[PDB]
Amino acid sequence: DIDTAAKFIGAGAATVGVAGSGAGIGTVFGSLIIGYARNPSLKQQLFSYAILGFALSEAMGLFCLMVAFLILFAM
C-alpha cells in the first residue's frame, strides 16, 4: 500500500538524523582526548563532562529513532 510505502520512506528519512549524533560523539571524544593530553591531572573530572556531553548527543539521536519507530509501529 502507498501508506505502508510512505511509512518505510519516512522511517529511512527520520533515521538519517542519526548522523548528527555520530558526529557529535566524534567531536566530544576527540575534544576529551585533546583536553586530557593537555591537563592529564584532571582526567577523572574531564571524563565526567565527556559522558554528559555524550549523554546529550545520543539524546538528540534518540529522538530521530523515536519518530522512526513511532512511524514504523505506532503509525
Binding site: 519507530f69 513511532l70 509501529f73 505506532a74
Partner: protein, 51 residues
C-alpha cells in the same frame, strides 16, 4: 506502541508517585551522617587565680 496505551497510565503514575516521594524519601531520611568526633583538648574555664 504500548507506551501510547492511555488506558494503563494511572497504574504507572500512582505507584511511582508513592515510591519516589514517600518511601524513598523516608529511606533517605533514616540515613543520617553524624558530625565527626572532635574531642576538644582545649576547654577550661578557670577563673583568674583568685588573688
Amino acid at each position: 506502541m504500548p507506551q501510547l496505551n492511555t488506558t494503563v497510565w494511572p497504574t504507572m503514575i500512582t505507584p511511582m508517585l508513592l515510591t519516589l516521594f514517600l518511601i524513598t524519601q523516608l529511606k533517605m531520611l533514616n540515613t543520617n551522617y553524624h558530625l565527626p568526633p572532635s574531642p576538644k583538648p582545649m576547654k577550661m574555664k578557670n577563673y583568674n587565680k583568685p588573688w
